[PDB]
């Protein structure tokens, strides 16, 4: 009976950084939406983290956000020949702030916003954010409408008001064209989990509600009293 559980705790089950978003943004003139890359902060994009959160109804944690920003070189002509290091800027936007329309905008100063400048060839950039919500818990399921007359959106997409992370390059790149990809990682710590609930049997299809297709319970075996194999797979 001296086999107690340490790696089954609520911390070690949830203190592992999972990838949440995959962005892509170039560094050239023309098509200004390709220069920056916006993302409203969900946890519902990637599945590998979503199933771990949707075992509990409510949560409350502090987080550790990290970014592995890597870049390539775009094909074609007029390439760099030689290229200094290129730095990236990650800006958080709170709910209700002014967003930049494009790159080199007026609003990229970020006096109040917690921007962070990161150089390539270094360690991945890291920050900590506390339990930030108006409510007392990050509710993973909200069985209720938005308006009191029962219209509007339905589901968890009413208390997910966490603003956006808008990333951009801060070099002009006079000669060449080069994309970069952003990979956001969430590692929640000091986690508390309330009201457990079953895992999702059906596959995920949306990031707005709990839509699903009716799937089978388990896989099929041969008979009611099938014991599998009596000897190995040979002969």
Partner 1 sequence: GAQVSTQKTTIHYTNINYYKDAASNSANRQDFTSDRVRSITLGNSTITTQECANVVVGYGVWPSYLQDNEATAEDQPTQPDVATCRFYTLDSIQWQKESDGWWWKFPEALKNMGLFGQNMEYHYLGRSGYTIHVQCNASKFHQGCLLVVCVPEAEMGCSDVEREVVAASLSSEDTAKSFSRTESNGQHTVQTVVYNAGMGVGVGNLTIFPHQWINLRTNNSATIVMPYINSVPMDNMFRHYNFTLMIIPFAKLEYTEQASNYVPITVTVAPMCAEYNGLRLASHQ
Partner 2 sequence: GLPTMLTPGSNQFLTSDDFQSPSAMPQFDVTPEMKIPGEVHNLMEIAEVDSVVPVNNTKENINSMEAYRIPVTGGDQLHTQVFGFQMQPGLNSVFKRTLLGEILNYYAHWSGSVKLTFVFCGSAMATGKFLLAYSPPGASPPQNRKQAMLGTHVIWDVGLQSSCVLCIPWISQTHYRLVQQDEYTSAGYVTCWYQTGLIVPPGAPPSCTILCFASACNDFSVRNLRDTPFIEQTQLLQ
User: Measured from the CB atom, is 141 or 204 closer to partner 2?
Assistant: 204
113 and 92 in contact (C-beta within 8 Å)? Answer: yes
Identify residues 102-141 at the interface with partner 2 (CB under 8 A).
106-107, 109-119, 122-137
Sign of CA dihedral 210, 213, 219, 220: positive
Q: Rule CB under 6 A: is residue 181 a binding residue for ligand SPH?
A: no
Q: Scan for tokens 């962070």, then name that residue.
A: 116
The torsion angles phi and psi of 107, rounded to 5 degrees, stand at: -90, 15
Binding piece for partner 2, criterion CB under 8 A, among 26-34, 69-77, 146-154, 171-179: 146-154
Interface positions with partner 1 (CB under 8 A): 6, 9, 11-12, 15, 57-58, 62, 128-131, 135-137, 139, 141-148, 150-151, 153-156, 189-190, 195-202, 205-206, 209-217
Q: What is the 3-state secondary structure (H, E, C) of 104-162?
A: CCHHHCCCCCCCEEEECCCCCEEEEECCCCCCCCEECCCCCECCCCCCCCECCCCCCCC
User: Measured from the CB atom, is 135 or 175 closer to partner 2?
Assistant: 135
The contact set with ligand SPH (CB under 6 A) reads 41-44, 63, 65, 90, 92, 114, 116, 127, 129, 138, 140, 156, 160, 162, 165
């Amino acid at each position: 009976n001296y086999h107690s559980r340490t790696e089954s705790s609520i911390e070690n089950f949830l203190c592992r950084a999972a990838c949440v978003y995959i962005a892509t943004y170039k560094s050239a003139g023309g098509t200004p939406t390709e220069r920056y890359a916006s993302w409203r902060i969900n946890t519902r994009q990637m599945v590998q983290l979503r199933r771990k959160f949707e075992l509990f109804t409510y949560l409350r944690f502090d987080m550790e956000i990290t970014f592995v920003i890597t870049s390539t070189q775009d094909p074609g002509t007029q390439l760099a020949q030689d290229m200094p290091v290129l730095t990236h800027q990650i800006m958080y936007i709170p709910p209700g702030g002014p967003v930049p329309n494009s790159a080199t905008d007026f609003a990229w100063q970020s006096s109040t916003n917690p921007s962070i400048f990161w150089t390539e060839g270094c360690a991945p950039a890291r920050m900590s954010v506390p339990f930030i919500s108006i409510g007392n818990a990050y509710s993973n399921f909200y069985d209720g409408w938005s308006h009191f007359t029962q219209e509007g959106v339905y589901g968890f997409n009413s208390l997910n008001n966490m603003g956006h992370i808008y990333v951009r390059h801060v070099n002009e790149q006079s000669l060449g064209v080069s994309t970069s990809t952003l990979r956001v990682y969430f590692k929640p710590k000091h986690v508390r989990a309330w009201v457990p609930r079953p895992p999702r049997l059906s596959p995920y299809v949306k990031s707005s509600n709990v839509n699903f297709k009716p799937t089978a319970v388990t896989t099929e075996r041969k008979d009611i009293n099938d014991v599998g194999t009596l000897r190995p797979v040979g002969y």
